[PDB]
Amino acid sequence: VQFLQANQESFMGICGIMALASAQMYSSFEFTCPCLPDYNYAYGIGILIVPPIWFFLLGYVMNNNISVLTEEWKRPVGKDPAVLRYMFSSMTQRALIAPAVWIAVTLMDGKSFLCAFSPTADLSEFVNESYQSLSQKELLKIQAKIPCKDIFEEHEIISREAATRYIRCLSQACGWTFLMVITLVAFLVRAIR
Amino acid sequence: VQFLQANQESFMGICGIMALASAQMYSSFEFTCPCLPDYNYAYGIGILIVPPIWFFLLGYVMNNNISVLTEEWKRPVGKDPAVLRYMFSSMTQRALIAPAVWIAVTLMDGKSFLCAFSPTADLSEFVNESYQSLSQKELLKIQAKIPCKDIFEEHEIISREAATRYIRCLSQACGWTFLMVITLVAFLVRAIR
Amino acid sequence: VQFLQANQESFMGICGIMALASAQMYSSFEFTCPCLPDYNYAYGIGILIVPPIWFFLLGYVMNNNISVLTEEWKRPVGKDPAVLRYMFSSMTQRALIAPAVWIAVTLMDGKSFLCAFSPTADLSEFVNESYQSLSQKELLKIQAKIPCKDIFEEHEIISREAATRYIRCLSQACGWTFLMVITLVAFLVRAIR
Amino acid sequence: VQFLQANQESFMGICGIMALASAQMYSSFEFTCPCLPDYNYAYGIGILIVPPIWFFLLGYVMNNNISVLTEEWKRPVGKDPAVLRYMFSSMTQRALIAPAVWIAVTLMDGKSFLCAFSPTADLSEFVNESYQSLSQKELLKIQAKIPCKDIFEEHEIISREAATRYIRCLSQACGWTFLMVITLVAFLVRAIR
Amino acid sequence: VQFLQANQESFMGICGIMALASAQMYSSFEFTCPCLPDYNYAYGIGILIVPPIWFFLLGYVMNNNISVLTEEWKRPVGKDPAVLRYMFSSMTQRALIAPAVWIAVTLMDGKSFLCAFSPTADLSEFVNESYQSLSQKELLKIQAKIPCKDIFEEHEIISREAATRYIRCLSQACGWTFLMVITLVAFLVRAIR
Amino acid sequence: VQFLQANQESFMGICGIMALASAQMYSSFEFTCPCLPDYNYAYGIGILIVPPIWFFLLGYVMNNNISVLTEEWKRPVGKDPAVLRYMFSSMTQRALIAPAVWIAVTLMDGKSFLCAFSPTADLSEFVNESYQSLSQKELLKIQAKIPCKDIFEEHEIISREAATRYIRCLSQACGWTFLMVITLVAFLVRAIR
Amino acid sequence: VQFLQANQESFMGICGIMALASAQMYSSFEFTCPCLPDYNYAYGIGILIVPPIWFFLLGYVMNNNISVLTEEWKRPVGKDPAVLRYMFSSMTQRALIAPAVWIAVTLMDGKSFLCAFSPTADLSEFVNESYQSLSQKELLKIQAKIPCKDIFEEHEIISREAATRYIRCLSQACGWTFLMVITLVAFLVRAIR
């Protein structure tokens, strides 16, 4: 939370104020994995996918030049040819910021990955040597409870903390690759056009 | 609480100051489920319904142009035809902000859902296999105590934490659908009129 | 306490500065129920009643136009007829704010209700089935100790937490009804006069 | 401590800055009852009495018009008759603020009352039924240790927490009566002169 | 620490900024009594005596008019007779502030008194009745360890907390007498010269 | 986190604002060593290497003179000869700040060193005397779990805390050498060119 | 950390901003004694010696008049004779501030002394009476672990807390002597030149 208060007053700005808004909203959001073999994937991917869509729509709405764009696109011939495209692309670029920040933040803190890819993941290195031959339905039901400290009661079968750290490392690697690709794309866009 | 201090000074504004007011008021509100089979639904739905109504009335009151609206609507013919409707609709739109923020915040933190829909919910996956045949009145009385950590003393029958996470996920899904529908409506309103 | 720091700088104001003053004073006030069958009601109703009276007097005192009102009311004929009534009613309205805030805050946090109406309340649903036939003097003395966690040592007779939550819900319902009635009255006053 | 930071910037002032100074000084003062039958009363009454005297002297000193008052009172005839009395009374009134704040704060938090009036108080309702006949010297020595959690080791004789709450309620009642009388006096002074 | 942040911005000042500097420096200073019969007195009196001397020297150094004073005192006859004495006395008075604040703060928090006067103090009321006849060298070595919670392991001989509270009360009494005498002297100085 | 809030407002700046950005980002980054003999080195070196590369790219992007550099380098002959090189080198120098801050901070807090060089390190002084003759594959697998408090369960073989402190000291030595070399290079650059 | 935030805004300054920088950097630095008989002295003296050297170099670099000094010292005859020496000495004096602050802070908090002089110190008063005759190599290895709470497991031989307090007192005495000598030197410099 201190990171938001620090990065504040930097723009001082409406463009770079939704970024800290999304970051702080994630910081004050109670992630709760259902820890069920059926609804884990859905919940994880939903937390990963839906809030950025909503932030996109919100950034499109809060821009004071949607009215003019609608008025011009509505006429068969509006009062120029492509200053409209300019402000439209500027609006889209300004809007695309907060979704990227949300996705980066939720990837660096690998809760959604841990909640989503836990039941199906291949954890054969962490499963105990005694219970190394059992129905994968049992392993599904057990591994589903890994992101839940309070519900997991199968310490004699799978080390919970080892698998947690493994999947969190995977999630952080993915987040860093995402950040690098995004920054390269921004570099090309600013250096070409 | 840090989210409110961060989002402050953004408008700097009386319109976008009731939003943080309602958010902070929820943050500093001691939600207390009665954990009784009779008054759970009432308390949950009341916390969900009444404070937004009060915020609506308050936002209507704090606007300095209710006096002029009353004076004009009181005359059979006032000193124009529809600049009154304009300021009235502006007042209503400004007022409708804080109820939406309250409902969104109280849905993302699924306490009201957990308090309200716990006694009647169908929790057959979490009920123990031994006590899978008993009077639904007993299950009513037991499930009523799920939102109360201090009162629940039936660990041999129902896993409390699993059901809590389940209902909290449901509540968060509902909150996200609410936010998306609200944002789409705002988008249409700003893009048409 | 963060709510006061957030709502600060909003008026920026002497009128809307006693509200946060009373709220913060309640936040930093050590409520201590005597937990005796004789002095519970007195203490609860006193905490509910006296501080708003004091805030009323204080708001009357801190207004710089009591001297002029006294000087005019003292003369048999003062130097107009009813600009005095105007400033007097404005002073009274400005003063009536902080008592309302104090009463609302102390009702939402149902300590005074829990301290006051505990010894006399009808708690027959929470009393154990074994001790369901005993002198109501015994129940008086026992229920008096409900708001005190450190003094209550009768867990085999009455569930303390259940009764606490029950009475806190009642208090919050009363507080919400109070807020709604107050806001309706303010609405009528602003819309008529 | 948050109350001081909140009430700050309100005057923005040298008059209403010693009030928060005294309040904060009490907040950051380590009250330590000696818990001995001989020095309890002395310590309690001293903490109640001496700091307000010191604040009075300090408020008299920090006012830049003591030099002129001394120079005029020193002459047999000074260069008017009673503008001196005016500034003297203004200085005295400005000085009398911080002692009142200190006394109110130290009364609302009933430590000085608990430390002072504990050894001599009549606690016959809290003394156990077994030890209801013993030399009042023993009760003196025992009750002296009531404000000390770490020293009290006579739980089989007197309930410490009950007596603590009782005396704290008495102290808060006294503090509220003090505040009411002070505010009434200020009201009369402002409404008459 | 909140007291310093509160008293800040009051002067807004270089004179009244060393006071909060010394107070905060004491607040962030790790007092560590050696708890040995030989070096307790030395450490206590040193913490009481040396830092105020250093603050005196520092306040003398940070004043931009020592160069002129040296240049004038160096000449046999400088370019007036006693405007030098005026600025010298003003410098000395400005410098004497921080030592007083340090001494007051370190007296109100009776650590230095507890560390210094513990081995030699007469604690015959707290010593157990069994060990009331033993070589005062043993009592010296034992009482030396009173300010150290981690080292004291003689609970069967002397109550540590009782003696701690006793000596802390003595220290606070001394601190209050010091503050009163200082304020009286300042009053006389401002009212005479 | 307080260090960032303190060093803020110092530049008041876009150049010296990415430094605190990177420092705060490290402060709010959840380092999680996988504690596996295969992926420890990779994770440690990645955390050490990749974020500074990303900060370099970001500092290159956020500078408003990449467009002009591209436009000039694109032409066979641009509209001078080497004012381009000047602004290019200034941009590169401004960009190189945040990577250095990240590397210094992550070296002073020896987590990456502890995670990376733990499985291969030579810890023969800390290994117990009983298990001083065993397959280095066993020691590899065991030492891999040293940075994980929750996973390490081999206290009868290797002291975890001793090895942790050893490797953290090594990391801090490396960080200090890095800082010294960087500062010497900056000194030469500023004193020559 | 609050001391830095308090002493901030005092200069408001680039000269007196490195002082708080070094103080805060020490506050947010994880001191970790290796607790080995060979590398304790090295680590302690290094933490005491190297960071002030780096702060000296940094303060020399951040001053905007090293370029002019180099340009003038480079010529056989520069465009006056000794205004160069003036700005050079001013730069050196401004640079010497932060090393002094670092050394003072690290001496008042006697970790470096405790880490460095623990293995070689003469602790014959704290060593148990049973183990008062043993090879000083054993005492070396044991005393090396005194600054480490988690590693020290020889409570039957040496009291760890007593020796810790002893060495911390020694370190604080040294720090106070350092501060006094530094202030006297500054006094002489300001009063003579």
Ligand SMILES: *[C@@H]1O[C@H](CO)[C@@H](O)[C@H](O)[C@H]1NC(C)=O
């Ligand atoms: C594996 O299972 C055995 C029981 O067969 C148990 O004793 C052992 O502690 C388990 N180990 C792990 C790492 O789960």
Ligand SMILES: *[C@@H]1O[C@H](CO)[C@@H](O)[C@H](O)[C@H]1NC(C)=O
């Ligand atoms: C279910 O009930 C049995 C008793 O028949 C008990 O042993 C078991 O622990 C219970 N399990 C759960 C998950 O409630």
Ligand SMILES: *[C@@H]1O[C@H](CO)[C@@H](O)[C@H](O)[C@H]1NC(C)=O
């Ligand atoms: C009720 O009293 C019985 C003793 O007759 C006791 O065993 C039981 O735990 C009590 N239950 C409650 C809810 O107080």
Ligand SMILES: *[C@@H]1O[C@H](CO)[C@@H](O)[C@H](O)[C@H]1NC(C)=O
């Ligand atoms: C009163 O004393 C008796 C011993 O006679 C003891 O058993 C009981 O717990 C005591 N009760 C209280 C409230 O002190």
Ligand SMILES: *[C@@H]1O[C@H](CO)[C@@H](O)[C@H](O)[C@H]1NC(C)=O
């Ligand atoms: C005093 O010493 C006796 C042993 O003779 C011990 O039983 C008792 O607890 C001690 N009391 C105190 C207050 O030290």
Ligand SMILES: *[C@@H]1O[C@H](CO)[C@@H](O)[C@H](O)[C@H]1NC(C)=O
């Ligand atoms: C070393 O191993 C032995 C068992 O042979 C055990 O008793 C001892 O505690 C161990 N010591 C350490 C420091 O690991």
Ligand SMILES: *[C@@H]1O[C@H](CO)[C@@H](O)[C@H](O)[C@H]1NC(C)=O
């Ligand atoms: C000293 O060693 C003896 C064993 O000979 C032990 O009983 C005693 O507790 C030890 N005391 C200290 C202070 O180390």
